[PDB]
Amino acid sequence: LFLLRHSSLYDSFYYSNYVNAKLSLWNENGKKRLHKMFARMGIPLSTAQETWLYMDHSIKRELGIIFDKNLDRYGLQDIIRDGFVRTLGYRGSISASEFVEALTALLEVGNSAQKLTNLRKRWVSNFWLSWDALDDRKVELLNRGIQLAQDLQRAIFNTGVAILEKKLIKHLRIYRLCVLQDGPDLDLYRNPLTLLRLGNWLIECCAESEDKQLLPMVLASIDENTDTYLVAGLTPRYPRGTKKPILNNFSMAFQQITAETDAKVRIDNFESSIIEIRREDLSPFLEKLTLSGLL
Amino acid sequence: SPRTLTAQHLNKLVSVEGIVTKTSLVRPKLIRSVHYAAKTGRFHYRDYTDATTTLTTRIPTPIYPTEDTEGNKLTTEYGYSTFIDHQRITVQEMPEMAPAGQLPRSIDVILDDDLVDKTKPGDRVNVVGVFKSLGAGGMNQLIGFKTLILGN
Amino acid sequence: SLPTFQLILNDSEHVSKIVRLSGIIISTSVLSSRATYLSIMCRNCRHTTSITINNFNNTVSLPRSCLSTINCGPDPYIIIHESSKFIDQQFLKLQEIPELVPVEMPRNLTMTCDRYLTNKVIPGTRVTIVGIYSIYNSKGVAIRTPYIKILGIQSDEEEEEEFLQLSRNPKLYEILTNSIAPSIFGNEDIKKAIVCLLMGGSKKILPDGMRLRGDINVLLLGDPGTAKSQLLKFVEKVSPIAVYTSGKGSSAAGLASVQRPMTREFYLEGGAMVLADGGVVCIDEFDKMRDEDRVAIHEAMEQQTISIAKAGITTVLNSRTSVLAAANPIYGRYDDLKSPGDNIDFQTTILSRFDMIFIVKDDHNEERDISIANHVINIHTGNANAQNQQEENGSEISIEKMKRYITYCRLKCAPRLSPQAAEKLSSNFVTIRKQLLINELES
Amino acid sequence: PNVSRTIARELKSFLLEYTDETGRSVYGARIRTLGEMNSESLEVNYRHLAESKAILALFLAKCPEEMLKIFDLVAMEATELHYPDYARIHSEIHVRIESNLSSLVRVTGVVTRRTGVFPQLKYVKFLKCGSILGPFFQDSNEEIRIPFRVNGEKTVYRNYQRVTLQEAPGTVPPGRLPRHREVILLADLVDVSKPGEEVEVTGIYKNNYDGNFATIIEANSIKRRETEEEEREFRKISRDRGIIDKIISSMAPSIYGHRDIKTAVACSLFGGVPKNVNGKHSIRGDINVLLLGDPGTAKSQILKYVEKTAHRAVFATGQGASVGLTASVRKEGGALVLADKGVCLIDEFDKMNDQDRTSIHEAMEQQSISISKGIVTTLQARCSIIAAANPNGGRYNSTLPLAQNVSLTEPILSRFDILCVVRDLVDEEADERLATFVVDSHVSPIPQELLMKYIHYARTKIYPKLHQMDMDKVSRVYADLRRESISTGITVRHLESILRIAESFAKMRLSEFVSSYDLDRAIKVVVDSFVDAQKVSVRRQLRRSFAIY
DNA sequence: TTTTTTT
Ligand SMILES: Nc1ncnc2c1ncn2[C@@H]1O[C@H](COP(=O)(O)OP(=O)(O)OP(O)(O)=S)[C@@H](O)[C@H]1O
């Protein structure tokens, strides 16, 4: 479960990526199922809204037994793990995972070609704020990023529901393909990492699995700078059922299509999975991607 | 000032300024009684105090006496029996002195014998006296300890 | 002398528990007093003890024995008033929030305050109060009124550094006209006069028997559909203390209050100009209003002196307000097609007692029309005008910032005009009066 | 009666296996949803109890007091066998249901003034015999009286309220005077009514013990005077496409035709969204309907259909005969306060004074009216106003304009959004159809129960939004409609009406996204409506309304 | 024995 210590157990599941597809939180059907899980927990709705700090000690000590006695109904039996927890004493303990999510969120917010390079410069500018953020004693800045992580996850799950209603997915046999050509709050989508976790949040959602044949997803967005449309590769996530050394596919395909006429194509992105392409030329890029399919 | 008068600037002599308003009624009060006994042919003596007059917390001695010791008629006398008038008035502070925008709030000060009917409702008066708090503050039988001002 | 301190920290489920909450202050009380330490006395045997008390909200009382035995009985103890100690008490009363769940009449509660919390907030703020929801009994069905004891009220140097930084930029006037109404395009003269209203002019305390007036007045008579209504609402939201009124007829908002009743006492409750002494008054529907207490408004903006000579009281009080108008002429846009007067049916002396008079027109400009169209579609959908966060990064980071700045601005500077500029105005008032001569005497 | 011990086993043979309409244990299927929502209330229909075992109906009229005490506790243990940890919520569920003593009575009335909510002792624990006495029951409106004394702590309370109720002025025999009776509230029913309402309560009737007999009604089930498969079977039908014309076809079958004005009225009650920007400002959330009548029209019958189907409707009279829509302290909210998040019905503007002019003025513009009264509050009003006017002299004078035809002023019209106008001309076949459908009236559309679940379920849930790629046509529509109607003489509020009307069509499909079809229907309803108000020279406007499509 | 209405 995500944002455990600084937020309500309610919002924790509400924004939970793992709980998302299994409970179909975007749809209304699982909503009552979620309250049903709390009805098994015997927790009042108002009790779930309180901050973790002020909740009763009984509710604390009995939390894991209650989890063992309720969550199994929905197939959540394999969750509890012996993961490490830091003790800094007086200001309270935090699991390494949560601090990681907050720091990476601090990386993405909390901050012709000259504007794009200027923005790239600003991305590097935000790195030193993170390098400075690695110290334990400098908590002042850390709490801002900790809360902004919640602001992101809110926008993630929101736009996610928007995508769920239109069903823009092209369920093709070769690979699934999608594109977000328009939507609210597109500025946050500039960071590749936004789309990295965003894609991950989709990839586990559309296919739990949900048999059969997990397929890769395509994603892109652009606002200005003449149809930049960053398209980052995405790979399916197995639900524990590395079964095979599959890893990735795209590097060879990118080398094959970039070896063609490659007009306006920019490999400027350091990571091989993401590339900038004109929409005009993205359509044939897709055609060439579908066939000849290297996979 | 009456605005910062409570709790501290308490149980002392306080100089108060303000407006004379809503003058109360004049009633006289008895202090020293004179009583004549018929058979002994002598006079007597008996006093009574209240919280306005003593300024010190003394045991109150209130009933008008008759037939004290032997059976002699305690005929009371007059003229020689003393009296003192009594009056209470309210003084709110000056309105221009008030905070940003509010209804001014007030207290009251009690006068004594030679100063009865010196303030009519509607004048400008400086007042020097002593902040006196009387009454059993709810420990009688819900917010008590009502106030006034003496030695004026 | 050193008493004991007081710490200050910040329904069936809520009886007497550590709960924080939030509401709005309905009405306070007058500073009252309970007792803290007190000594008693036996009136016959002269036996004295002393008791200090803290929780004045029933538990214990005075005994009825001389206590030297441990018959003077019953209660012989007399409270020594000359050797006692006291604190202050406030007793607020709070009103529910006007934005959520009034689907009713407003409900209320009873507050009670302790030592250093007294006399702190003048009513009208939107505040949070940490409390104890306890129960008392006073005025066989076990009817008890509940209450909340108040612990830790919270209100509504480096800032001076950024204040001085913001004071000297020569683009401050325009950046403030980029701060008032982001939802409203156009109407820039109105958009500018609001800037001057929230600051307030000089205040003269002359040897002359009167003092002059500082705050200004805003009129918005004109054609409907202008959304001058949204502008006056946002004016109320910006200033720290202000009264917004929509017309002459309410559900519940009044204007010198006359309250006659318990103990058969007359007392002064309040009103509306009283809350806005030294603030902004917004009056909508200037022509939809009656002449019943209008006279108080015909004077409150000019000499700051409300007189009351009724059955209860006979005082002369203060009112340092500023009134903001939003009228509608008769028949809409046609009032300017006949003679240019013909607007207030009574007379023009009220307008002479105002400061600024603006006329809003309605002229077709297709580019302006398309711009006002897509500007407003962008306001509703796709948050295009709402880009503001990079604008926050570049201009006017907050509204609450503007409020803190006005609080700092009003009492610090002592403005006055300059002597070399006075002859300019003296030569200009001549030209305006001549302008009226030209339009008047020949016509 | 001690036999209720054995009756507790058998009364659940009715609870969890009530087989009606092919099984469907409504109680057993309901309990999982009751503890799901933590409502601590169970509903019991007197029909089902009278249908299965009427011995309990006898146990209602003869002894309603201890029967509930035996019934709710077994409902508690019957619920806890279903939820293993429900006792952590409340652990107690209370249930709902001279010849009048000791019986349950179905009672009508109107709510007079009332009091606040105070807590009342429920558990009583008591220095004589050393320590405390022990727990005892807190009798309702009576003491325990087991030397000792009740201490402040260790006391579980319960919220209390008594409600005065007086007789309803509607079924009063004409000319007589109403009388009073007492109603006391308990736990989940705390402060349910509100002044200015009617009510139907299910009360048990008692009387006082002795004074040193007044009767008191304790009430169980408040119902106001008029499920999972119920919304999903609902969604199996709501997925279709042709519900647009069908709504108007299912709106009002009494007068048969007039689909345009009926669709506009059907759109009005269905609602709009004000959409307050986060922190910035709120615009407007209502649809304004004006319907210029004609004597000789059953236009009033339509608005009566509006009042019976809709949520909160108070018929505002023609001239001062009633309620008065402006709250005022007199020897207290107006009728508009009653209609919050509802639709009000105000008509005959020809005979309404300035009081109504200020109230309606402010309410449809930005929702809140202020005065020159000794109390200062800001109560808002989110009513929806539907009018029904009447022309001056003739029903339609001449080719002269609408503003010349009506006797109102321009800004009051400016507050209005849609103008549906009917026409009176001699049509032979329309009279034939009219008389024949009248005969049918004295003899495929949605049944009225489903449409009422439709609008109530929709307005609490459907939240329309819009994208930025389709409003450019709309921008062009406003630009041409304003810029071309310059020669005609126009409403900027109608620009906001475009989204606020068009959002209801997405509310019709419950899709949350505004398709192009919704904007096209909104344009095809608004533009021609503005067209219909002119002179015979409207042929030009007809000849420029092609590009409009 | 005085404050909000309406014919
Ligand atoms: N830029 C805008 N210009 C005009 N109206 C707008 C604008 N943006 C939103 N609005 C809305 O359109 C409505 C138009 O009415 P107003 O501008 O209030 O007209 P009005 O002149 O205030 O009429 P009143 O309030 O009786 S004087 C506003 O109340 C808002 O709801």
PDB file of N, CA, C and O in Angstrom, chain B residues 3 6-7 10-11 55-57 59-60 95-96 100-103 105 133-135 139 141-145, chain C residues 30-31 33-35 43 53 58 62 78 80-82 84 86-88 91 119 122 268 274 277 316 318 320:
ATOM      1  N   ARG B   3     -11.755  49.068  29.597  1.00  0.00           N
ATOM      2  CA  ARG B   3     -11.481  47.952  28.686  1.00  0.00           C
ATOM      3  C   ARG B   3     -10.441  46.975  29.206  1.00  0.00           C
ATOM      4  O   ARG B   3     -10.538  45.775  28.958  1.00  0.00           O
ATOM      5  N   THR B   6     -10.387  44.435  34.037  1.00  0.00           N
ATOM      6  CA  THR B   6     -10.489  43.192  34.767  1.00  0.00           C
ATOM      7  C   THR B   6      -9.192  42.474  35.036  1.00  0.00           C
ATOM      8  O   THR B   6      -8.201  42.642  34.349  1.00  0.00           O
ATOM      9  N   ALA B   7      -9.306  41.542  35.987  1.00  0.00           N
ATOM     10  CA  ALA B   7      -8.374  40.594  36.609  1.00  0.00           C
ATOM     11  C   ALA B   7      -7.100  41.149  37.230  1.00  0.00           C
ATOM     12  O   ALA B   7      -6.715  40.770  38.340  1.00  0.00           O
ATOM     13  N   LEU B  10      -6.947  45.234  39.171  1.00  0.00           N
ATOM     14  CA  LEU B  10      -7.861  44.734  40.207  1.00  0.00           C
ATOM     15  C   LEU B  10      -7.401  44.879  41.666  1.00  0.00           C
ATOM     16  O   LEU B  10      -6.203  44.817  41.957  1.00  0.00           O
ATOM     17  N   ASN B  11      -8.386  45.009  42.589  1.00  0.00           N
ATOM     18  CA  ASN B  11      -8.214  45.076  44.061  1.00  0.00           C
ATOM     19  C   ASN B  11      -7.258  46.195  44.466  1.00  0.00           C
ATOM     20  O   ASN B  11      -6.502  46.082  45.425  1.00  0.00           O
ATOM     21  N   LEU B  55     -15.587  48.030  53.764  1.00  0.00           N
ATOM     22  CA  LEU B  55     -14.365  47.932  52.953  1.00  0.00           C
ATOM     23  C   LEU B  55     -13.493  46.738  53.373  1.00  0.00           C
ATOM     24  O   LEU B  55     -12.482  46.453  52.732  1.00  0.00           O
ATOM     25  N   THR B  56     -13.868  46.035  54.440  1.00  0.00           N
ATOM     26  CA  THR B  56     -13.198  44.870  54.989  1.00  0.00           C
ATOM     27  C   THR B  56     -14.211  43.752  55.156  1.00  0.00           C
ATOM     28  O   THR B  56     -15.364  44.018  55.506  1.00  0.00           O
ATOM     29  N   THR B  57     -13.799  42.508  54.895  1.00  0.00           N
ATOM     30  CA  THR B  57     -14.730  41.392  55.036  1.00  0.00           C
ATOM     31  C   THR B  57     -14.990  41.053  56.503  1.00  0.00           C
ATOM     32  O   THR B  57     -14.267  40.253  57.098  1.00  0.00           O
ATOM     33  N   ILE B  59     -18.020  40.060  59.667  1.00  0.00           N
ATOM     34  CA  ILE B  59     -19.242  39.293  59.922  1.00  0.00           C
ATOM     35  C   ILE B  59     -20.448  40.226  59.888  1.00  0.00           C
ATOM     36  O   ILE B  59     -20.532  41.158  60.696  1.00  0.00           O
ATOM     37  N   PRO B  60     -21.393  40.017  58.976  1.00  0.00           N
ATOM     38  CA  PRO B  60     -22.564  40.895  58.895  1.00  0.00           C
ATOM     39  C   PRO B  60     -23.523  40.633  60.044  1.00  0.00           C
ATOM     40  O   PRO B  60     -23.792  39.487  60.403  1.00  0.00           O
ATOM     41  N   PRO B  95     -16.710  57.300  23.917  1.00  0.00           N
ATOM     42  CA  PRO B  95     -16.839  56.530  22.659  1.00  0.00           C
ATOM     43  C   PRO B  95     -15.756  56.729  21.587  1.00  0.00           C
ATOM     44  O   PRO B  95     -15.518  55.801  20.811  1.00  0.00           O
ATOM     45  N   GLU B  96     -15.088  57.873  21.502  1.00  0.00           N
ATOM     46  CA  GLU B  96     -14.048  58.059  20.494  1.00  0.00           C
ATOM     47  C   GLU B  96     -12.806  57.221  20.738  1.00  0.00           C
ATOM     48  O   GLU B  96     -12.088  56.897  19.800  1.00  0.00           O
ATOM     49  N   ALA B 100     -11.609  49.567  16.757  1.00  0.00           N
ATOM     50  CA  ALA B 100     -11.980  49.779  15.351  1.00  0.00           C
ATOM     51  C   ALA B 100     -13.470  50.026  15.160  1.00  0.00           C
ATOM     52  O   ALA B 100     -13.866  51.130  14.779  1.00  0.00           O
ATOM     53  N   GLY B 101     -14.318  49.064  15.452  1.00  0.00           N
ATOM     54  CA  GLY B 101     -15.707  49.452  15.432  1.00  0.00           C
ATOM     55  C   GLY B 101     -16.436  48.589  16.427  1.00  0.00           C
ATOM     56  O   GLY B 101     -16.646  47.418  16.120  1.00  0.00           O
ATOM     57  N   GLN B 102     -16.912  49.136  17.545  1.00  0.00           N
ATOM     58  CA  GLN B 102     -17.697  48.350  18.489  1.00  0.00           C
ATOM     59  C   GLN B 102     -18.551  49.209  19.393  1.00  0.00           C
ATOM     60  O   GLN B 102     -18.382  50.422  19.532  1.00  0.00           O
ATOM     61  N   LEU B 103     -19.463  48.508  20.012  1.00  0.00           N
ATOM     62  CA  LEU B 103     -20.345  49.036  20.992  1.00  0.00           C
ATOM     63  C   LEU B 103     -19.506  49.156  22.247  1.00  0.00           C
ATOM     64  O   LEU B 103     -18.898  48.161  22.651  1.00  0.00           O
ATOM     65  N   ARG B 105     -18.395  49.119  26.157  1.00  0.00           N
ATOM     66  CA  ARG B 105     -18.816  48.254  27.255  1.00  0.00           C
ATOM     67  C   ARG B 105     -18.506  48.956  28.568  1.00  0.00           C
ATOM     68  O   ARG B 105     -17.581  49.761  28.626  1.00  0.00           O
ATOM     69  N   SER B 133     -15.321  44.212  44.756  1.00  0.00           N
ATOM     70  CA  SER B 133     -16.087  43.086  44.243  1.00  0.00           C
ATOM     71  C   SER B 133     -16.799  42.399  45.387  1.00  0.00           C
ATOM     72  O   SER B 133     -16.137  41.859  46.266  1.00  0.00           O
ATOM     73  N   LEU B 134     -18.132  42.382  45.361  1.00  0.00           N
ATOM     74  CA  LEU B 134     -18.914  41.722  46.401  1.00  0.00           C
ATOM     75  C   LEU B 134     -19.729  40.547  45.896  1.00  0.00           C
ATOM     76  O   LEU B 134     -19.860  40.317  44.696  1.00  0.00           O
ATOM     77  N   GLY B 135     -20.346  39.853  46.842  1.00  0.00           N
ATOM     78  CA  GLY B 135     -21.248  38.749  46.550  1.00  0.00           C
ATOM     79  C   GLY B 135     -20.602  37.378  46.514  1.00  0.00           C
ATOM     80  O   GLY B 135     -19.440  37.204  46.157  1.00  0.00           O
ATOM     81  N   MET B 139     -21.059  30.204  44.672  1.00  0.00           N
ATOM     82  CA  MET B 139     -20.858  29.131  45.613  1.00  0.00           C
ATOM     83  C   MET B 139     -21.961  29.161  46.637  1.00  0.00           C
ATOM     84  O   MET B 139     -21.861  28.511  47.676  1.00  0.00           O
ATOM     85  N   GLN B 141     -25.569  28.465  46.083  1.00  0.00           N
ATOM     86  CA  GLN B 141     -26.363  27.255  46.053  1.00  0.00           C
ATOM     87  C   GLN B 141     -25.566  26.106  45.450  1.00  0.00           C
ATOM     88  O   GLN B 141     -24.351  26.203  45.299  1.00  0.00           O
ATOM     89  N   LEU B 142     -24.732  30.739  35.760  1.00  0.00           N
ATOM     90  CA  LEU B 142     -23.772  30.243  36.743  1.00  0.00           C
ATOM     91  C   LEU B 142     -22.494  31.037  36.872  1.00  0.00           C
ATOM     92  O   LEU B 142     -21.536  30.503  37.385  1.00  0.00           O
ATOM     93  N   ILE B 143     -22.433  32.277  36.404  1.00  0.00           N
ATOM     94  CA  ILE B 143     -21.198  33.042  36.487  1.00  0.00           C
ATOM     95  C   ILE B 143     -21.442  34.218  37.402  1.00  0.00           C
ATOM     96  O   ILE B 143     -22.270  35.082  37.099  1.00  0.00           O
ATOM     97  N   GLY B 144     -20.726  34.241  38.519  1.00  0.00           N
ATOM     98  CA  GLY B 144     -20.806  35.273  39.543  1.00  0.00           C
ATOM     99  C   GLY B 144     -19.747  36.349  39.621  1.00  0.00           C
ATOM    100  O   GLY B 144     -19.156  36.761  38.617  1.00  0.00           O
ATOM    101  N   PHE B 145     -19.519  36.782  40.866  1.00  0.00           N
ATOM    102  CA  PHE B 145     -18.540  37.775  41.282  1.00  0.00           C
ATOM    103  C   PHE B 145     -18.696  39.091  40.548  1.00  0.00           C
ATOM    104  O   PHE B 145     -17.767  39.640  39.971  1.00  0.00           O
TER     105      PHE B 145
ATOM    106  N   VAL C  30     -18.989  40.325  27.177  1.00  0.00           N
ATOM    107  CA  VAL C  30     -18.202  41.392  27.805  1.00  0.00           C
ATOM    108  C   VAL C  30     -17.267  40.672  28.756  1.00  0.00           C
ATOM    109  O   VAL C  30     -17.583  39.563  29.212  1.00  0.00           O
ATOM    110  N   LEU C  31     -16.073  41.236  28.969  1.00  0.00           N
ATOM    111  CA  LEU C  31     -15.039  40.580  29.749  1.00  0.00           C
ATOM    112  C   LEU C  31     -15.580  40.394  31.160  1.00  0.00           C
ATOM    113  O   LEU C  31     -15.794  41.365  31.891  1.00  0.00           O
ATOM    114  N   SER C  33     -15.688  37.793  34.993  1.00  0.00           N
ATOM    115  CA  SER C  33     -14.705  37.244  35.923  1.00  0.00           C
ATOM    116  C   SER C  33     -15.212  36.239  36.939  1.00  0.00           C
ATOM    117  O   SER C  33     -16.127  36.536  37.703  1.00  0.00           O
ATOM    118  N   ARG C  34     -14.564  35.083  36.970  1.00  0.00           N
ATOM    119  CA  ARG C  34     -14.697  34.037  37.973  1.00  0.00           C
ATOM    120  C   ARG C  34     -13.537  34.251  38.909  1.00  0.00           C
ATOM    121  O   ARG C  34     -12.729  35.145  38.700  1.00  0.00           O
ATOM    122  N   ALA C  35     -13.440  33.442  39.945  1.00  0.00           N
ATOM    123  CA  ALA C  35     -12.383  33.593  40.929  1.00  0.00           C
ATOM    124  C   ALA C  35     -11.446  32.414  40.872  1.00  0.00           C
ATOM    125  O   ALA C  35     -11.797  31.352  40.374  1.00  0.00           O
ATOM    126  N   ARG C  43     -17.677  33.018  60.946  1.00  0.00           N
ATOM    127  CA  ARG C  43     -18.071  34.303  61.523  1.00  0.00           C
ATOM    128  C   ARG C  43     -18.189  34.292  63.029  1.00  0.00           C
ATOM    129  O   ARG C  43     -18.361  35.364  63.612  1.00  0.00           O
ATOM    130  N   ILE C  53      -9.028  27.568  42.889  1.00  0.00           N
ATOM    131  CA  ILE C  53      -9.837  26.815  41.936  1.00  0.00           C
ATOM    132  C   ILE C  53      -9.438  27.115  40.500  1.00  0.00           C
ATOM    133  O   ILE C  53      -8.939  28.200  40.186  1.00  0.00           O
ATOM    134  N   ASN C  58     -19.817  23.392  40.659  1.00  0.00           N
ATOM    135  CA  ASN C  58     -20.579  22.181  40.372  1.00  0.00           C
ATOM    136  C   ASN C  58     -20.029  20.960  41.119  1.00  0.00           C
ATOM    137  O   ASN C  58     -20.783  20.117  41.600  1.00  0.00           O
ATOM    138  N   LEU C  62     -18.915  25.327  49.457  1.00  0.00           N
ATOM    139  CA  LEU C  62     -18.474  25.697  50.783  1.00  0.00           C
ATOM    140  C   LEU C  62     -19.094  24.760  51.814  1.00  0.00           C
ATOM    141  O   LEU C  62     -20.277  24.432  51.717  1.00  0.00           O
ATOM    142  N   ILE C  78     -17.562  32.942  55.022  1.00  0.00           N
ATOM    143  CA  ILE C  78     -17.802  34.195  54.334  1.00  0.00           C
ATOM    144  C   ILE C  78     -16.579  34.446  53.464  1.00  0.00           C
ATOM    145  O   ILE C  78     -15.441  34.347  53.937  1.00  0.00           O
ATOM    146  N   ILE C  80     -13.792  36.213  51.813  1.00  0.00           N
ATOM    147  CA  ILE C  80     -13.000  37.416  51.999  1.00  0.00           C
ATOM    148  C   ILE C  80     -12.764  38.049  50.632  1.00  0.00           C
ATOM    149  O   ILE C  80     -11.994  37.513  49.831  1.00  0.00           O
ATOM    150  N   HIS C  81     -13.408  39.185  50.345  1.00  0.00           N
ATOM    151  CA  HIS C  81     -13.215  39.790  49.027  1.00  0.00           C
ATOM    152  C   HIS C  81     -11.992  40.687  48.914  1.00  0.00           C
ATOM    153  O   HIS C  81     -11.580  41.015  47.799  1.00  0.00           O
ATOM    154  N   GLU C  82     -11.410  41.091  50.018  1.00  0.00           N
ATOM    155  CA  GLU C  82     -10.247  41.955  49.985  1.00  0.00           C
ATOM    156  C   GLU C  82      -8.948  41.203  49.762  1.00  0.00           C
ATOM    157  O   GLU C  82      -7.920  41.841  49.542  1.00  0.00           O
ATOM    158  N   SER C  84      -8.552  38.262  47.571  1.00  0.00           N
ATOM    159  CA  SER C  84      -8.829  37.260  46.557  1.00  0.00           C
ATOM    160  C   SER C  84      -8.063  37.575  45.271  1.00  0.00           C
ATOM    161  O   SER C  84      -7.502  38.660  45.092  1.00  0.00           O
ATOM    162  N   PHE C  86      -8.199  37.033  40.827  1.00  0.00           N
ATOM    163  CA  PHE C  86      -9.136  36.852  39.741  1.00  0.00           C
ATOM    164  C   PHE C  86      -8.467  36.846  38.371  1.00  0.00           C
ATOM    165  O   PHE C  86      -7.355  37.342  38.190  1.00  0.00           O
ATOM    166  N   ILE C  87      -9.214  36.323  37.394  1.00  0.00           N
ATOM    167  CA  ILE C  87      -8.835  36.210  35.997  1.00  0.00           C
ATOM    168  C   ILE C  87      -9.991  36.775  35.185  1.00  0.00           C
ATOM    169  O   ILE C  87     -10.957  37.284  35.737  1.00  0.00           O
ATOM    170  N   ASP C  88      -9.875  36.711  33.869  1.00  0.00           N
ATOM    171  CA  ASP C  88     -10.862  37.278  32.962  1.00  0.00           C
ATOM    172  C   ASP C  88     -11.574  36.180  32.191  1.00  0.00           C
ATOM    173  O   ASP C  88     -11.084  35.056  32.076  1.00  0.00           O
ATOM    174  N   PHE C  91     -16.486  34.337  26.849  1.00  0.00           N
ATOM    175  CA  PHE C  91     -17.769  33.756  26.398  1.00  0.00           C
ATOM    176  C   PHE C  91     -18.152  34.106  24.957  1.00  0.00           C
ATOM    177  O   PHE C  91     -19.042  34.931  24.716  1.00  0.00           O
ATOM    178  N   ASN C 119     -10.050  38.812  24.857  1.00  0.00           N
ATOM    179  CA  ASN C 119     -10.048  40.007  24.032  1.00  0.00           C
ATOM    180  C   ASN C 119      -9.181  39.851  22.798  1.00  0.00           C
ATOM    181  O   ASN C 119      -8.401  40.733  22.450  1.00  0.00           O
ATOM    182  N   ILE C 122     -11.894  40.326  17.061  1.00  0.00           N
ATOM    183  CA  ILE C 122     -13.142  41.040  16.752  1.00  0.00           C
ATOM    184  C   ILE C 122     -13.921  40.162  15.785  1.00  0.00           C
ATOM    185  O   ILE C 122     -13.311  39.595  14.873  1.00  0.00           O
ATOM    186  N   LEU C 268     -27.643  47.801  23.096  1.00  0.00           N
ATOM    187  CA  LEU C 268     -27.213  48.025  21.723  1.00  0.00           C
ATOM    188  C   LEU C 268     -26.580  46.790  21.101  1.00  0.00           C
ATOM    189  O   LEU C 268     -25.512  46.366  21.538  1.00  0.00           O
ATOM    190  N   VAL C 274     -21.445  49.161  11.452  1.00  0.00           N
ATOM    191  CA  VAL C 274     -20.647  48.978  12.637  1.00  0.00           C
ATOM    192  C   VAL C 274     -19.574  47.930  12.415  1.00  0.00           C
ATOM    193  O   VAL C 274     -18.446  48.088  12.885  1.00  0.00           O
ATOM    194  N   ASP C 277     -16.669  49.439  10.066  1.00  0.00           N
ATOM    195  CA  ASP C 277     -16.023  50.710  10.375  1.00  0.00           C
ATOM    196  C   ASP C 277     -14.571  50.567   9.946  1.00  0.00           C
ATOM    197  O   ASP C 277     -13.871  49.676  10.433  1.00  0.00           O
ATOM    198  N   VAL C 316     -23.428  59.321  20.497  1.00  0.00           N
ATOM    199  CA  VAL C 316     -22.965  59.725  19.167  1.00  0.00           C
ATOM    200  C   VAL C 316     -21.793  58.794  18.892  1.00  0.00           C
ATOM    201  O   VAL C 316     -20.750  58.904  19.539  1.00  0.00           O
ATOM    202  N   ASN C 318     -19.083  56.321  16.154  1.00  0.00           N
ATOM    203  CA  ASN C 318     -18.187  56.355  15.001  1.00  0.00           C
ATOM    204  C   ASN C 318     -18.459  55.306  13.959  1.00  0.00           C
ATOM    205  O   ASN C 318     -18.849  54.182  14.259  1.00  0.00           O
ATOM    206  N   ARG C 320     -16.304  54.554  10.348  1.00  0.00           N
ATOM    207  CA  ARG C 320     -15.257  54.899   9.375  1.00  0.00           C
ATOM    208  C   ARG C 320     -15.355  54.110   8.066  1.00  0.00           C
ATOM    209  O   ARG C 320     -14.336  53.761   7.493  1.00  0.00           O
TER     210      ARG C 320
END
